[PDB]
Design a binder for this molecule. Structure first.
Ligand SMILES: Cc1sc2c(c1C)C(c1ccc(Cl)cc1)=N[C@@H](CC(=O)OC(C)(C)C)c1[nH]nc(C)[n+]1-2
Length: 127
């Protein structure tokens, strides 16, 4: 069970822009989650080889992680806030799909998601 290529972070064919909401998603949302004590499993794609999770990419067909999101934000990959919000939600949902309630990794995702929800509640109106 080899690892797939990671999600793209650059694509000249994809439209993109800078928006004040995307700036907030980087400076506030990503930065807050990235520094958290429980961020580290989510800072790069799941390595199913090293973790001995050969079923991971049989079950999780839309992988996502904060390393990817960080690069997307820094590299101005997104057209709007919704695209980036969707990536975060994909990441959390994947973790809950693959794992079981009360697992350590699920508690870690839950902690991060609580903070995500607190920050997204104050997403600024588009300028
Ligand atoms: C680098 C990464 S990425 C990751 C994990 C780790 C370690 C952990 C994990 C991280 C921290 C703690 Cl305290 C416990 C588990 N769990 C796996 C699934 C699993 O069951 O893996 C073990 C078989 C436990 C290796 C998982 N699912 N989704 C993700 C994002 N992760």
């Amino acid at each position: 069970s080899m690892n797939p290529p990671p999600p793209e972070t650059s694509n000249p064919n994809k439209p993109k822009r800078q928006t004040n909401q995307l700036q907030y998603l980087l400076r506030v949302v990503l930065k807050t989650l990235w520094k958290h004590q429980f961020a580290w499993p989510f800072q790069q794609p799941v390595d199913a080889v090293k973790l001995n999770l050969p079923d991971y990419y049989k079950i999780i067909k839309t992988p996502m992680d904060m390393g990817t999101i960080k690069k997307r934000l820094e590299n101005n990959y997104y057209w709007n806030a919704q695209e980036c919000i969707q990536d975060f939600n994909t990441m959390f949902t994947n973790c809950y799909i693959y794992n079981k309630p009360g697992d350590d990794i699920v508690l870690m995702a839950e902690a991060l998601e609580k903070l995500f929800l607190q920050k997204i509640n104050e997403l600024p109106t588009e300028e």
